[PDB]
Design a protein around this ligand. Structure first.
Ligand SMILES: *[C@@H]1O[C@H](CO)[C@@H](O[C@@H]2O[C@H](CO)[C@@H](O)[C@H](O)[C@H]2NC(C)=O)[C@H](O)[C@H]1NC(C)=O
Ligand SMILES: *[C@@H]1O[C@H](CO)[C@@H](O)[C@H](O)[C@H]1NC(C)=O
Ligand SMILES: *[C@@H]1O[C@H](CO)[C@@H](O)[C@H](O)[C@H]1NC(C)=O
Ligand SMILES: *[C@@H]1O[C@H](CO)[C@@H](O)[C@H](O)[C@H]1NC(C)=O
Ligand SMILES: *[C@@H]1O[C@H](CO)[C@@H](O)[C@H](O)[C@H]1NC(C)=O
Ligand SMILES: *[C@@H]1O[C@H](CO)[C@@H](O)[C@H](O)[C@H]1NC(C)=O
Ligand SMILES: *[C@@H]1O[C@H](CO)[C@@H](O)[C@H](O)[C@H]1NC(C)=O
Ligand SMILES: *[C@@H]1O[C@H](CO)[C@@H](O)[C@H](O)[C@H]1NC(C)=O
Ligand SMILES: *[C@@H]1O[C@H](CO)[C@@H](O)[C@H](O)[C@H]1NC(C)=O
Ligand SMILES: *[C@@H]1O[C@H](CO)[C@@H](O)[C@H](O)[C@H]1NC(C)=O
Ligand SMILES: *[C@@H]1O[C@H](CO)[C@@H](O)[C@H](O)[C@H]1NC(C)=O
Ligand SMILES: *[C@@H]1O[C@H](CO)[C@@H](O)[C@H](O)[C@H]1NC(C)=O
Ligand SMILES: [Ca+2]
Ligand SMILES: [Ca+2]
Ligand SMILES: [Ca+2]
Ligand SMILES: [Ca+2]
Ligand SMILES: [Ca+2]
Ligand SMILES: [Ca+2]
Ligand SMILES: [Ca+2]
Ligand SMILES: [Ca+2]
Ligand SMILES: [Ca+2]
Ligand SMILES: [Ca+2]
Ligand SMILES: [Ca+2]
Ligand SMILES: [Ca+2]
Ligand SMILES: [Ca+2]
Ligand SMILES: [Ca+2]
Ligand SMILES: [Ca+2]
Ligand SMILES: [Ca+2]
Ligand SMILES: [Ca+2]
Ligand SMILES: [Ca+2]
Ligand SMILES: [Ca+2]
Lengths: 673, 856, 192
């Protein structure tokens, strides 16, 4: 409701909370009532005679604009403007429609360590196949090539001149000196050029196990015109079989210059690679995100878990299982492209702390996410409109700003511009000045006095002393003192004092209320600022908390097991904690630990359940309260008891939820006399 | 907040790599390494010795062996404060062979004088000395390249004796971990132990702990990182917050942690207790909007800087503001922890535009200015800076009035008197004191202090005005030493006060500026960042409650724990105290009730005219301000919250007394205290267990015996540990025939226990009829041995089995109508009921019985 | 019952006495010791210790360490003894300035150890007498009556205000009586 403290204007009233409204109708406030009685909640004001057409109630609203001349739009709407009131969320829908046939530019990086010899043999006979696979998805496609080994300095590479001449372990055949990054083939749609350029490559070697492919990726992403990128889908296949160096490894080689993230290509070679450190993963992710390049990690079996962690840092990336001879690569690109395209993320650029933004997802598979920090759901299908709900909440009366909501991996953007709604559309151009004694104007139903004149109707002058007659309205009752001793009576209304003690905000009609006199949780009034606020004896909390001191969360309580039942039916949830009855233990009232063995009696049901014995005592119905049977063995109290006839019957008695409700499994083999 | 930034001396040198490594030495000089500077042909690396007295520095002469080509001397440094020692290492020695080239390392140890220095797949690419420390036994050199870059460390006990410390190779998971990239020494009970960091372990990181168990070093704990590529373990720091001689926590930096708005992360890790696991508790962060700032690249101990006897640390962020760099300062807190927010941030851009990578190297814990205050050395690219701590000051102020209260004739309405000629006086005294201890002489520290005086602050019109200014405000500035000064000034009232119920209030608040010290390089003292800056005193009016007497009130306080006998800790979380206050005398002004309770009670609410209450601890409640009238009485309940892990003994006391502004002598009515018993909630269960014998049968024609065991399981499921007693009732004879001979009790947990056996007689003589009703052979119709076993310590959340074993015979069997007899044995747990109690409805599980059926 | 002395554990302890004379030893760890009534001998041992003497004439024995201690003797004439800092064995605390201990009862601290760049202090309140070490020391009194003993070495002693009793001991010592009616003993060696 409307926790208002001190309010004296329509804007001041609305700024005190999202539920406060302002009844403007004249002849509403009695002579003995103050102007703060207007700032109440809507139903209360409508109850006391105010109408629906004379309350102000500024309300946050959103209106969208779309480009009619723009065809084949993939993310709509384009521009949205908001009129935000603090404490009230504006919401609008953003629709994503997957388009068809977007060309592919695939760049290939391969390690040339000595273990990659067979892969090099297979890959250099593969350009036409990969181009054909690209064309089976879109009408136009181009392919490229690259290479990397490691930095040419110890301890990463042996710097002995003989070993720099031939770093391969075997001296028999051809092997090229180590290098950091070489750009081999420009992005082209010709297969013969791919065959000829790659066919000239020779294998290399180094000393360490990890390889410096992050330098190669940063150089690929930082030199757009040399690579040949066009404004289409950009892919980057990373084919390795080991780990990767990252920032900090260069100190072993006495290299402590951080990577600048700028192009350092001369004669298609990454010279100056021995004076810069490896990039950090954050730098690589930021560069790839800003250039819309989507990595595809084609790694061996033992490295899949290692490279899978990168996907939490780098969205729009995929990990594939690469064979030891690299024969399953093209199928890997197909699957990686399917996985990349099937998932959609919705995110916004950086915005200040005064604005909160939340996303809700609805899509084809039926999975719906609510109150998420970013939008995400899989199964995005072609020509299926998938909608996201964006909720924007302002915490203060903000100024004009703008932030962009974007679909990650695409150039299309949604621009959002925000306005405040901290203004009241009051009627003042035709108000009667006579009601203000001519010394003011009726704004929103209240009068504002000119210079010198004071009072609710401007009936007093500040230079004159307050009359003793008006002092009678400044006390609550015959025993209450004027303004409760914490204020001054001037022109018939109390004017409260201030206090040097922090948090001492004196308010109220008679200055009776105070801000620090409420229920205290852990020495803090209302559990501290993070749970609720004090309003002169009553504590009202922020959403998500309840109770006399806001110590109890409202929902999403811990009283529920994964099967979504409160305390397994063995207690009552009271302030996020189950109050178990009988001898059942916290937190979910599951186990009965000191509990007498129940297997003594439940043989009476077990005899008839799986041995076809009929009614003795009674039929096994309206008896056996809450006992059911399980076909498969159920983990629980293993038992063995004497049959009612003489044999040995052993059953395992699992416990389900409820009161005296179990699940039984009776064995069929019996030891008999 | 007390690190100097305007008078920082900068060392500049054109050698390459200058400022990469920095270390303080012997309280007067700082050593700086230049790893990449080319001294001569096939030589790389140089050392410099920079002095604060002169402000310049020259290289330290050192004869490099011819085999140490391109050794990169100065990449790592270490020092010892007492005795003075210096260790310098070059980890990049290019040993060139016929077919290969290897990267080994050398280290040089220096004594007090810098003139003579001793030289210190599998161990080939060792890079020994990459990070190094000095133990009391000798140098400690790490090898990041040992065993396929798994790591390790070499600990030298002599010039030619060393031991290798590393992990255990159960698998290849530790390959390429770079263990020994960072190193530290922990102290406890004057014995040293090692901490080693591996920032590349599984690409996530790892930090290790090593202890010498029976003369051999072994790893006893380790922690791990979370985010890939963050370098968890790339920098280590041991902190002793209380400075008692035992290390409390270890700071671990992850300079390459990635968030959308922050870069860098430092983790606080308290040391494990015994064999407990090592865990992280808090994480420190840099400022917002500084990605790739490399927060946590270098961090060192600064010692106590603010003078609160708690150790403080500094952390470096070389990558901030586009590689300009920054240095953060964190204060230590009680509880072996680090405060989560920084106290100062020094930015390189605010010092000089030429600074780059400011904060890449740090060193602190000594004084180099000879004024007794610790100093911090920060290394940058081509520069080394010296930041100096400053004296910390506090101010205490006191106000007195004379007379203490306004006289009646001053403010009474009168027509034959001169208006505005009232009088008064207020005395104001200020005292400036110093907190930090240092070597500067007395009388050098002077400060300029200005302050405000506000009469009736918070009131539109003040009742009293100063005589000299004729308004409610006054400004004055003056210079203070470390000595109290006093000043007095008259108070005047222009008109009568028609609301004498409110005292006149005086407010004071100040600002302090410290004058520089010319003898110690223009150092300026500063005010404490938490110093109180506002003070208030009250000036009450005289009372005339009746016939111009002194206002004589009579106050009485009583309270009672109504309908409550014992305070059960662990049961109900709150309890009431109904307290009543009476005023038999005339009007009471500013009535105040103060409570006193132990440390495990917290004030929750007050329910009942008006009652405002605020906080062995204490709380103060207000009784109907301003006035509590004549023949008045108030009754109210004060709620308390009792901690579930409270320790109040068996007897808790509450104390309360009443007070008022009239300030009259204390009386027995004014004071009251009452005492309440305490009990502790305990929950523990005893149950029969399945392996206990369920069935036995016999043939009367045969005389074979059998073994019987009744196994009980005892658990302390409660949150308390208490001494307990177990009693087993065992049927032994029936109509003078032995049933269960010489029964014995044995415990599975081999916990301490003592047992004593006693016999009790049956209550029913006619055993035949009793068997005829029910076929139970128990203590009602048989002789029972009562085995009582006493356990002095029954631990929390721990359990054991208690088997009761003995052999049987079947010569006591009665041929009743039923074809069976039951042998029942009961085990029930006792405790001192005067201290411990069971919760309602939970007492049914402290007893159990076990039955064994016998048929022919 | 009927026990006068107590020796603590190697861990943190809280030791309290009675109205009789007690000798309380804390050993290793951080200990809080209260002597209460009578004349007591308090030795905290290693670690950061807080020591109280309350009423009576108490004695505090300090050890060879750099860890600071807080000492409050309360009412009565109280003394602190620093003789165990220098011993024939090996000394852990540094004295690189060669000044033993430095005492200033007016400023309520004792510089128990001192490296070139690090100074270690003790907080001392309501203690009227100090006993030095075998090395040279600096002893400074306060406005009350103090008994200052230098023992061996070339010491300097300043009594401050009041009627003091200053002892020099063996070695060449500098004794200053300052204001009041003082009693000066030089001892062996050439003194002024
Ligand atoms: C830790 O150091 C020990 C030696 O102190 C290493 O043990 C050697 O390991 C190699 C590799 O398998 C074996 O060939 C040697 O026979 C081992 N020697 C001994 C004496 O055990 C051990 O590998 C190191 N652990 C790690 C993780 O590097
Ligand atoms: C390949 O690219 C060239 C360059 O423009 C173009 O002329 C040709 O049509 C392209 N071929 C295919 C099949 O797209
Ligand atoms: C592609 O987009 C970039 C965006 O900066 C633009 O400059 C360029 O003109 C576009 N077209 C081509 C062919 O690069
Ligand atoms: C040592 O460094 C110099 C620097 O130019 C270089 O020329 C020389 O080859 C290096 N020595 C070895 C053995 O690599
Ligand atoms: C005292 O506080 C006021 C504001 O509350 C401030 O304007 C004034 O400067 C302060 N006094 C001094 C001496 O700074
Ligand atoms: C009070 O008088 C002094 C001195 O005349 C003056 O500096 C100050 O501004 C005055 N204050 C007000 C509020 O007028
Ligand atoms: C006892 O305290 C509770 C607070 O939990 C309060 O609600 C109740 O009114 C009190 N009862 C009495 C008799 O004071
Ligand atoms: C109330 O009791 C406390 C107990 O510590 C005492 O300090 C205080 O002076 C007492 N006040 C009155 C008015 O009796
Ligand atoms: C005793 O019990 C065993 C167990 O089955 C059985 O084989 C035996 O026949 C029984 N003896 C008598 C005398 O009933
Ligand atoms: C108990 O009886 C069993 C079987 O009759 C026998 O094996 C065992 O030795 C006996 N033990 C004792 C202590 O009599
Ligand atoms: C013993 O057995 C009898 C017969 O069933 C039963 O009534 C009684 O409760 C049992 N316990 C005791 C202590 O007598
Ligand atoms: C008691 O015996 C059972 C036998 O099944 C065993 O599982 C359990 O661990 C024992 N209790 C304890 C505390 O070891
Ligand atoms: Ca391969
Ligand atoms: Ca410690
Ligand atoms: Ca501190
Ligand atoms: Ca200094
Ligand atoms: Ca005795
Ligand atoms: Ca101890
Ligand atoms: Ca004593
Ligand atoms: Ca001690
Ligand atoms: Ca001590
Ligand atoms: Ca004593
Ligand atoms: Ca004493
Ligand atoms: Ca004393
Ligand atoms: Ca001496
Ligand atoms: Ca003296
Ligand atoms: Ca002497
Ligand atoms: Ca004297
Ligand atoms: Ca004298
Ligand atoms: Ca002498
Ligand atoms: Ca002499």
């Amino acid at each position: 409701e409307c926790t208002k403290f001190k309010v004296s204007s329509c804007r001041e009233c609305i700024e005190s909370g999202p539920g406060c409204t302002w009844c403007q109708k004249l002849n509403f406030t009695g002579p003995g009532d103050p102007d703060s009685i207007r700032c109440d909640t809507r139903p209360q004001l409508l109850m006391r005679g105010c109408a629906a057409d004379d309350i102000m109630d500024p309300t946050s609203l959103a209106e969208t604009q779309e480009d009619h001349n723009g065809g084949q739009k993939q993310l709509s709407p384009q521009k949205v403007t908001l009129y935000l009131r603090p404490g009230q969320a504006a919401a609008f829908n953003v629709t994503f429609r997957r388009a068809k046939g977007y060309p592919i530019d695939l760049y290939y990086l391969m390690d040339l360590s000595y273990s990659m010899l067979d892969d090099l043999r297979n890959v250099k006979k593969l350009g036409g196949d990969l181009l054909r696979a690209l064309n089976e998805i879109t009408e136009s496609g181009r392919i490229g090539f690259g290479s990397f080994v490691d930095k040419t300095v110890l301890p990463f590479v042996n710097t002995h001149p003989d070993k720099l001449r031939n770093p391969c372990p075997n001296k028999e055949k051809e092997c090229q000196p180590p290098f950091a990054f070489r750009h081999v083939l420009k992005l082209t749609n010709n297969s013969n050029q791919f065959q000829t350029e790659v066919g000239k490559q020779l294998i290399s070697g180094n000393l360490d196990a990890p390889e410096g492919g992050l330098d190669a990726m940063m150089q690929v992403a930082a030199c757009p015109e040399e690579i040949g990128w066009r404004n289409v889908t950009r892919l980057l296949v990373f084919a390795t079989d080991d780990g990767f160096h990252f920032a900090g490894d260069g100190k072993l080689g006495a290299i402590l210059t951080p990577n600048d993230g700028r192009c350092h290509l001369e004669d298609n070679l990454y010279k100056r690679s021995n004076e810069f450190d490896y990039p950090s993963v954050g730098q690589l992710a930021h560069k790839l995100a800003e250039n819309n390049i989507q990595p595809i990690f084609a790694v061996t079996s033992r490295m899949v878990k290692t490279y899978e962690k990168l996907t939490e840092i780098i969205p729009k990336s995929a990990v594939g299982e690469l064979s030891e001879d690299s024969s399953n690569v093209v199928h890997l690109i197909k699957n990686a492209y399917n996985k990349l395209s099937s998932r959609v993320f919705l995110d916004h650029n950086a915005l200040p702390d005064t604005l909160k933004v939340t996303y809700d997802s609805f899509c084809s598979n039926g999975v719906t996410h609510r109150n998420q920090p970013r939008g995400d759901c899989d199964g995005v299908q072609i020509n299926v409109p998938i909608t996201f709900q964006v909720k924007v909440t302002a915490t203060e009366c903000i100024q004009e700003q703008s932030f962009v909501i974007r679909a990650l991996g695409f150039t299309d953007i949604v621009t959002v511009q925000v306005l405040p709604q901290c203004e009241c559309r009051c009627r003042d151009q035709s108000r009667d000045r006579s009601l203000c004694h001519g010394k003011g104007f009726l704004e929103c139903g209240i009068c504002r006095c000119d210079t010198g004149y004071i009072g609710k109707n401007c009936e007093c002058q500040t230079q004159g002393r307050s009359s003793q007659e008006l002092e009678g309205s400044c006390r609550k009752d015959n025993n209450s003192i004027i303004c409760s001793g914490l204020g001054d009576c001037v022109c018939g209304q109390c004017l409260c004092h201030t206090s040097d003690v922090p948090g001492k905000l004196i308010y109220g009609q008679y200055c009776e209320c105070d801000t620090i006199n409420c229920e205290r949780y852990n020495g803090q009034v209302c559990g501290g600022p993070g749970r609720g606020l004090c309003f002169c004896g009553k504590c009202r909390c922020h959403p998500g908390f309840e109770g006399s001191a806001c110590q109890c969360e409202r929902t999403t309580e811990g009283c529920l097991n994964p099967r979504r039942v409160e305390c397994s039916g063995r207690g009552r949830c009271r302030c996020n904690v189950c109050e178990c009855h009988s001898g059942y233990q916290l937190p979910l009232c599951q186990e009965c630990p000191g509990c007498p063995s129940p297997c003594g009696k439940y043989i009476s049901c077990a005899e008839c359940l799986k041995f076809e014995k009929g009614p003795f005592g009674k039929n096994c119905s309206a008896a056996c309260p809450g006992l059911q049977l399980s076909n498969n063995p159920v983990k629980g109290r293993t038992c063995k008891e004497r049959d009612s006839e003489g044999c040995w019957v052993a059953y395992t008695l699992e416990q389900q939820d409820g009161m005296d409700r179990y699940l039984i499994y009776v064995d069929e083999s019996r030891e008999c006399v | 907040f007390n690190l100097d930034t305007e008078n920082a001396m900068t060392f500049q040198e054109n050698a390459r790599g200058f400022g990469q490594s920095v270390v303080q030495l012997q309280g007067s000089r700082v050593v700086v390494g230049a790893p990449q500077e080319i001294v001569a042909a096939n030589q790389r690396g140089s050392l410099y010795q920079c002095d604060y007295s002169t402000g310049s520095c020259e290289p330290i002469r050192l004869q490099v062996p011819v085999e140490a080509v391109n050794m990169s001397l100065g990449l790592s440094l270490a020092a010892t404060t007492s005795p003075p020692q210096l260790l310098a290492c070059g980890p990049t020695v290019h040993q060139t062979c016929s077919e290969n080239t290897y990267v080994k390392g050398l280290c040089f140890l220096f004594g007090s004088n810098l003139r003579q220095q001793p030289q210190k797949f599998e161990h080939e690419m060792s890079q020994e000395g990459f990070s190094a420390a000095i133990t009391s036994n000798g140098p400690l050199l790490s090898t990041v390249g040992s065993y396929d870059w798994a790591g390790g460390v070499f600990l030298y006990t002599s010039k030619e004796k060393s031991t290798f410390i590393n992990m255990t190779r159960v698998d290849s998971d530790m390959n390429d971990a770079y263990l020994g990239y960072a190193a530290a020494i922990i102290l406890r009970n004057r014995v040293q132990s090692l901490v080693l960091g591996a920032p590349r372990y599984q690409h996530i990181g790892l930090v290790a702990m090593f202890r010498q168990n029976t003369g051999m070093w072994e790893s006893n704990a380790n922690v791990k990182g979370t985010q890939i590529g963050a370098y968890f373990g790339a920098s280590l720091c041991s902190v002793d917050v209380d400075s008692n001689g035992s290390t409390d926590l270890v700071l671990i930096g992850a300079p390459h942690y990635y968030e959308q708005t922050r870069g860098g992360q430092v983790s606080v890790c308290p040391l494990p207790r015994g064999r407990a696991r090592w865990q992280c508790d808090a994480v420190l962060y840099g400022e917002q909007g500084q990605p790739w700032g490399r927060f946590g690249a270098a961090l060192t101990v600064l010692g106590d800087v603010n003078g609160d006897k708690l150790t403080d640390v500094a952390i470096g962020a070389p990558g901030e503001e586009d590689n300009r760099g920054a240095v953060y300062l964190f204060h230590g807190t009680s509880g072996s922890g680090i405060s989560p927010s920084h106290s100062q941030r020094i930015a390189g851009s605010k010092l000089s535009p030429r600074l780059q990578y400011f904060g890449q190297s740090l060193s602190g814990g000594q004084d180099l200015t000879m004024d007794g205050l610790v100093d911090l050395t920060v290394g940058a690219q081509g520069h080394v800076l010296l930041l100096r701590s400053q004296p910390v000051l506090r101010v205490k102020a006191i106000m007195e009035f004379n007379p203490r209260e306004v006289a009646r004739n001053v403010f009474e309405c009168n027509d034959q008197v001169v208006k505005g000629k009232e009088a008064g006086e207020v005395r104001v005294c200020l005292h400036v004191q110093k907190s930090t201890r240092d070597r500067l002489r007395e009388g050098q520290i002077q400060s300029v202090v200005t302050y405000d005086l506000a009469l009736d602050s918070g009131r539109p019109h003040s009742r009293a005005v100063f005589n000299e200014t004729k308004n409610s405000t006054r400004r004055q500035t003056q210079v203070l030493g470390l000595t109290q000064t006093c000043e007095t000034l008259k108070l005047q009232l222009p008109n009568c006060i028609e609301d004498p119920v409110s005292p006149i209030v005086l407010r004071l608040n100040f600002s302090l500026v410290g004058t520089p010290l010319s003898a110690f390089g223009n150092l300026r003292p500063v005010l404490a960042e938490d110093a109180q800056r506002l003070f208030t005193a009250l000036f009450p009016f005289e009372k005339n409650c009746g016939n111009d007497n002194i206002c004589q009130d009579d106050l009485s306080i009583t309270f009672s724990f109504m309908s409550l006998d014992c305070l059960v800790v662990g049961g109900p979380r709150e309890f009431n105290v109904t307290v009543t206050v009476r005023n038999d005398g005339e009007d009471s002004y500013r009535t105040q009730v103060t409570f006193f309770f132990p440390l495990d009670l917290s004030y929750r609410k007050v329910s009942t005219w008006r009652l405002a209450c605020e906080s062995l601890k204490s709380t103060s409640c207000s009784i109907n301000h301003p006035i509590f009238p004549e023949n008045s009485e108030v009754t109210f309940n004060i709620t308390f919250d009792v901690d579930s892990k409270a320790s109040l003994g068996n007897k808790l006391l509450l104390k309360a007394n009443v007070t008022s502004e009239n300030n009259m002598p204390r009386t027995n009515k004014t004071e009251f205290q009452l005492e309440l018993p305490v009990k502790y909630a305990v929950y523990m269960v005893v149950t029969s267990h399945g392996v206990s014998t369920k069935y036995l049968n016999f043939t009367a024609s045969e005389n074979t015996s059998r073994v019987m065991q009744h196994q009980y399981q005892v658990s302390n499921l409660g949150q308390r540990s208490l001494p307990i007693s177990l009693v087993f009732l065992v049927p032994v004879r029936l109509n003078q025939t032995v049933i269960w001979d010489r029964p014995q009790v044995t415990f599975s947990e081999n916990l301490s226990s003592t047992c004593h056996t006693k016999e009790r007689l049956p209550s029913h003589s006619d055993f035949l009829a009793e068997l005829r009703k029910a076929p139970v052979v128990n203590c009602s119709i048989a002789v029972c041995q009562r085995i009582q076993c006493d356990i002095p310590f029954f631990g929390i959340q721990e359990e054991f089995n208690a088997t009761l074993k003995g052999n049987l015979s079947f010569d006591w069997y009665i041929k009743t109508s039923h074809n069976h007899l039951l042998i029942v044995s009961t085990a029930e747990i006792l405790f001192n009921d005067s201290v411990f109690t069971l919760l309602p409805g939970q007492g049914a599980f402290v007893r159990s019985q076990t039955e064994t059926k016998v048929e022919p | 019952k009927n026990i006068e002395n107590l020796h603590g554990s190697r861990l943190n302890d809280r030791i309290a006495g009675d109205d009789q004379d007690n000798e309380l030893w804390g050993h290793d760890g951080n200990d809080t010791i209260r002597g209460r009534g009578g004349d007591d001998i308090l030795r905290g041992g290693l670690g950061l210790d807080t020591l109280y003497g309350e009423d009576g004439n108490d004695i505090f024995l300090q050890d060879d360490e750099t860890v600071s201690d807080d000492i409050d003797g309360g009412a009565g004439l109280d003394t602190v003894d620093y003789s165990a800092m220098i011993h024939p064995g090996r000394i852990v605390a540094p004295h690189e300035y060669g000044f033993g201990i430095e005492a200033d009862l007016s400023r309520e601290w004792v510089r128990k150890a001192s490296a070139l760049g690090v100074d270690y202090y003790d907080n001392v309140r309501n203690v009227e007498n100090v006993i030095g070490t075998s090395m040279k020391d600096v002893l400074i009194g306060d406005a009350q009556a103090n008994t200052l003993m230098g023992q061996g070495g070339d010491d300097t002693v300043r009594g401050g205000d009041g009627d003091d009793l200053l002892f020099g001991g063996d070695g060449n010592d500098m004794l200053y009586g300052d204001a009041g009616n003082d009693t000066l003993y030089g001892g062996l060696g050439d003194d002024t």
